[PDB]
Amino acid sequence: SMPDYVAKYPVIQTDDERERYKAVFQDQFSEYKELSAEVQAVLRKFDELDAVMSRQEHERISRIHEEFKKKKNDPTFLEKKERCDYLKNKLSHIKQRIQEYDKVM
């Protein structure tokens, strides 16, 4: 699931290569923008929820706590957060290769 973007994106040598890196950046940045929003919306909600806190109160807390804990630890969510963290680093790598080439040329 996580290719080595350092090996796949070496130092840019030609404008054709720069254009190819730009197109990969645009394709991936749109994919990252969509995941980043979804991941961030979940994490912020958790922060709001922690801020809210009879033997009924004990029942309600535990109910909330389990529900809250279940959503943050969910493997589908954590796979998306992992893809998101990967993409951020991959995109920063590509951005840096482009900027480096522009500066030189």
Side-chain angles (χ1 to χ4, degrees):
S1 46
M2 298 175 281
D4 183 354
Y5 50 77
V6 175
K8 301 294 247 188
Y9 294 89
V11 165
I12 301 169
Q13 286 214 263
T14 70
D15 287 348
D16 286 330
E17 274 158 42
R18 189 216 183 266
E19 289 312 286
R20 280 187 247 140
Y21 283 39
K22 166 198 136 172
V24 173
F25 183 95
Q26 299 177 314
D27 179 74
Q28 298 297 260
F29 187 80
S30 86
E31 191 186 305
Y32 168 76
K33 184 181 67 177
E34 283 194 63
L35 269 176
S36 196
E38 190 195 329
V39 164
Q40 215 184 302
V42 177
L43 303 176
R44 281 175 296 191
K45 183 180 178 61
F46 294 147
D47 296 331
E48 295 171 315
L49 256 63
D50 280 347
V52 163
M53 302 182 290
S54 188
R55 56 198 291 150
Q56 180 177 30
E57 181 142 18
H58 205 260
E59 299 171 36
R60 167 174 46 175
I61 291 179
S62 299
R63 157 162 297 137
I64 293 181
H65 185 271
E66 273 299 316
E67 179 287 332
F68 151 91
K69 186 184 168 282
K70 192 183 167 182
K71 187 183 292 299
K72 51 175 198 71
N73 77 42
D74 179 60
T76 75
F77 174 72
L78 299 179
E79 276 295 344
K80 290 191 248 178
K81 195 189 162 298
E82 178 180 36
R83 170 79 183 153
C84 196
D85 296 343
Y86 170 75
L87 282 176
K88 180 182 182 219
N89 293 322
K90 169 171 172 183
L91 288 169
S92 303
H93 174 78
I94 300 177
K95 183 178 190 180
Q96 178 254 339
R97 285 291 190 218
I98 294 160
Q99 282 176 340
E100 163 202 335
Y101 186 73
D102 293 355
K103 153 180 73 191
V104 166
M105 298 279 298

